[PDB]
Design an enzyme around this catalytic site. Structure first.
Site, PDB file in Angstrom:
ATOM      1  N   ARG A  21       0.784  -1.104   0.444  1.00  0.00           N
ATOM      2  CA  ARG A  21      -0.250   0.120  -0.077  1.00  0.00           C
ATOM      3  C   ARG A  21       0.879   1.539   0.183  1.00  0.00           C
ATOM      4  O   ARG A  21       0.246   2.715   0.102  1.00  0.00           O
ATOM      5  CB  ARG A  21      -1.155   0.119   1.191  1.00  0.00           C
ATOM      6  CG  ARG A  21      -1.843   0.656   1.065  1.00  0.00           C
ATOM      7  CD  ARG A  21      -3.286  -0.539   0.862  1.00  0.00           C
ATOM      8  NE  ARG A  21      -4.706   0.252   1.634  1.00  0.00           N
ATOM      9  CZ  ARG A  21      -4.910   0.795   0.929  1.00  0.00           C
ATOM     10  NH1 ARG A  21      -5.003   1.811   0.213  1.00  0.00           N
ATOM     11  NH2 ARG A  21      -6.245   1.274   2.180  1.00  0.00           N
ATOM     12  N   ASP A  22       2.197   1.299   0.154  1.00  0.00           N
ATOM     13  CA  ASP A  22       2.507   2.519  -0.185  1.00  0.00           C
ATOM     14  C   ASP A  22       4.209   1.973  -0.305  1.00  0.00           C
ATOM     15  O   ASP A  22       5.130   2.517   0.026  1.00  0.00           O
ATOM     16  CB  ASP A  22       2.999   2.744   1.118  1.00  0.00           C
ATOM     17  CG  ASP A  22       3.429   4.433   1.255  1.00  0.00           C
ATOM     18  OD1 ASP A  22       3.739   5.310   0.510  1.00  0.00           O
ATOM     19  OD2 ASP A  22       4.070   5.155   2.396  1.00  0.00           O
ATOM     20  N   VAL A  23       4.643   1.302  -1.749  1.00  0.00           N
ATOM     21  CA  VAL A  23       5.590   0.934  -2.362  1.00  0.00           C
ATOM     22  C   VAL A  23       6.387   2.392  -3.082  1.00  0.00           C
ATOM     23  O   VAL A  23       5.695   2.867  -3.493  1.00  0.00           O
ATOM     24  CB  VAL A  23       5.324  -0.383  -3.336  1.00  0.00           C
ATOM     25  CG1 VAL A  23       7.016  -0.715  -3.553  1.00  0.00           C
ATOM     26  CG2 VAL A  23       4.897  -0.984  -3.155  1.00  0.00           C
ATOM     27  N   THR A  71       0.793   6.794  -0.297  1.00  0.00           N
ATOM     28  CA  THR A  71       1.254   8.935  -0.907  1.00  0.00           C
ATOM     29  C   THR A  71       0.762   8.933  -2.111  1.00  0.00           C
ATOM     30  O   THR A  71       0.587   8.312  -3.170  1.00  0.00           O
ATOM     31  CB  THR A  71       2.470   8.363  -0.818  1.00  0.00           C
ATOM     32  OG1 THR A  71       3.376   7.680   0.121  1.00  0.00           O
ATOM     33  CG2 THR A  71       3.545   9.810  -1.723  1.00  0.00           C
TER      34      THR A  71
END
Ligand code: ANP
Ligand code: ANP
Ligand code: MN
Ligand code: MN
Lengths: 340, 340
Positions: free
Chosen positions: B176-178, B213
């Protein structure tokens, strides 16, 4: 369009002062302006509290060398990219500061510079902004709640509407960032629109496109349109300020996340409960039909259907504005400050 | 769903250590971990560089009392609002940190706590993240440019794809935030997925909705949909990392403003020039057809049409990945660090 150097911009300003900093017995001075303390340390600019003679002043310091690095990506025109700096943005702001003269707008009294550091002199609005923010909006203190009374809200709105009249009709400027932190109050009950850092000169009443503070941006910005009526943009934002003044919270907006903010603004109905509702839980009186009516005229998602500033000023809701409510409110507020 | 207290969450962790801070001759210690300096001061958490025996460690400190204030607005279910805290978010993160064990993911070696302050022990990935950010992305230094070579990029992607295999297939977790700042490299050429602060357990491969992000978020997030396939979300984000690794800049994204970011992501074609193009002007070699082909499989705006992790790992483009390119790259990089 693309303006020249600072010197050029200021060449026809008739109160441009040569910068003269100095100490007299460990009080730091800017040109007779005695530096008391700094009011607000922004990311770039910064405002300074000063004294000269017996009056109080807030000097806003910018610096060329500081904002000329910090470059971003504007549009293109040519698809050959575009490269702008925060100093470029400030040039546009400078020209504007140089043009604004109105009892309903913060207007500078002089610009002090060496063509790098810049100090814009302003009167000091001793009651600061109409609301303050951190995790949410408050009047004086984060601890006791208290909502601005309606009769006072009436005064503020009528006041800011008046300043729209000046910028929109007399000056052809769209403010582009109308928010609580930008409506300043003095001790005597004067209210002034300020910070023209996002402001632009309209072209046939239209403004460029998509710039300001996200949670105050109108539905238009989420269309195919590309151009929007400057006035209606500022109207929408005053509407939010109104919503904020009612509830001490921003409408559909709120933190985390912004997709959820933007899927909202364009399509979604604003909820209108009673003063404390979004606020009963942080702390672990209330409105009336007409109040929500008036406010709903500001927040028409379609801009050509949104309220005018003209219609607003002459609406029933403001027809009983008593300026004495604000003067009394502002007086007691000032007495509650500098008690902290 | 709504998890219990920290004690409860950790009750079945078999390396939970009692907090013991102390000084031995003005070096501060956490439980034998000698505090060297802090690597990264986040807004809340913070990572600490330590030493124990002769090994190097990065301890991530959270604190209950600190993040339990800082409450936001989630959804509702009941329309009777919802009130969550950043400590609530951390509970979910804690459970996850407790579950992840994989050579391709940063996995903790112990949790040190008093049930308020919390120190998660991690190996120290001495080459830090694959790229660094400030105004734009760089490898070692803001001054000399240098793009990661393709053969090394190949290795990194294959590596992170492998970690998707673990979290998606073996653990049912969506990262969910790679992003670049979350792919860590050691000196020896190991690359590890990290920071599961935004990570969630999927329900039938679907994830909750809109979190991470902004500039790394997929087109799906701008639909009516409400649910999205966890894997494809992480695929999209790796695609961006890939785009970033190619150009040292984020694609359509970029600062000021986010409406312009979001009117973009959902509909708009990504531009694929040659390595330095968006970058020739900050500083006042280049790719090949196949590279852009592969990358375009990641950035299909429609998720059911986006590349799988399976297909990716077995694509022609990675079929010549030589791990020795990364090992050599990582070795020379480490030699260029601590030279500053
Ligand atoms: N003349 C003034 N009198 C009293 N307070 C002032 C005055 N001018 C500015 N301030 C305070 O300083 C704050 C920020 O000033 P501003 O000119 O808006 O700078 P900024 O960098 O744009 N900050 P923000 O608008 O909050 O992003 C205002 O919200 C006021 O609280
Ligand atoms: N084990 C490690 N070895 C080396 N560096 C690390 C390690 N863990 C974290 N860091 C560094 O600390 C940074 C931030 O850590 P992180 O766990 O992502 O905290 P955060 O508050 O989520 N910051 P961000 O992800 O940038 O918003 C990383 O980008 C790395 O540069
Ligand atoms: Mn402002
Ligand atoms: Mn992170």
């Amino acid at each position: 369009g693309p303006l020249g150097s600072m010197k050029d911009i200021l060449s026809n300003y008739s109160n441009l002062i040569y910068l003269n900093k100095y100490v007299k017995e460990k009080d730091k001075y800017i040109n007779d302006y005695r530096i008391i303390r700094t009011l607000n340390q922004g990311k770039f600019n910064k405002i300074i509290l000063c004294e000269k003679d017996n009056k109080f002043y807030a000097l806003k310091k910018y610096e060329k060398s500081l904002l000329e690095k910090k470059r971003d990506f504007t549009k293109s025109n040519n698809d050959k990219i575009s490269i702008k700096s925060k100093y470029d943005d400030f040039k546009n702001e400078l020209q504007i500061i140089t043009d604004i003269k109105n009892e309903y707008c913060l207007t500078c009294e002089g610009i002090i510079t060496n063509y790098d550091e810049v100090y814009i002199i302003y009167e000091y609005m001793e009651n600061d902004s109409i609301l303050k923010f951190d995790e949410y909006f408050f009047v004086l203190d984060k601890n006791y709640t208290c909502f601005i009374p309606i009769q006072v809200i009436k005064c503020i709105i009528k006041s800011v509407l008046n300043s729209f009249s000046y910028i929109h009709n007399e000056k052809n400027i769209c403010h582009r960032d109308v928010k609580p932190s930008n409506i300043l109050m003095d001790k005597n009950g004067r209210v002034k629109l300020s910070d023209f850092g996002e402001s632009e000169y309209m072209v046939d009443k239209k403004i460029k496109g998509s710039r300001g503070t996200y949670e105050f941006m109108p539905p238009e910005f989420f269309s195919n349109e590309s151009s929007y009526n400057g006035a209606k943009v500022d109207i929408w934002s005053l509407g939010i300020c109104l919503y904020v003044m009612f509830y001490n919270v921003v409408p559909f907006s709120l933190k985390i996340s912004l997709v959820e903010l933007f899927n909202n603004i364009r399509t979604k109905n604003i909820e209108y409960p009673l003063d404390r509702n979004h606020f009963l839980y942080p702390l672990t009186n209330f409105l009336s039909n007409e109040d929500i009516d008036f406010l709903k005229l500001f927040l028409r998602k379609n801009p050509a259907e949104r309220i005018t500033s003209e219609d607003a000023l002459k609406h029933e809701w403001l027809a009983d504005t008593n300026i004495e409510d604000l003067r009394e409110f502002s007086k007691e507020l000032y007495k509650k400050r500098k008690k902290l």
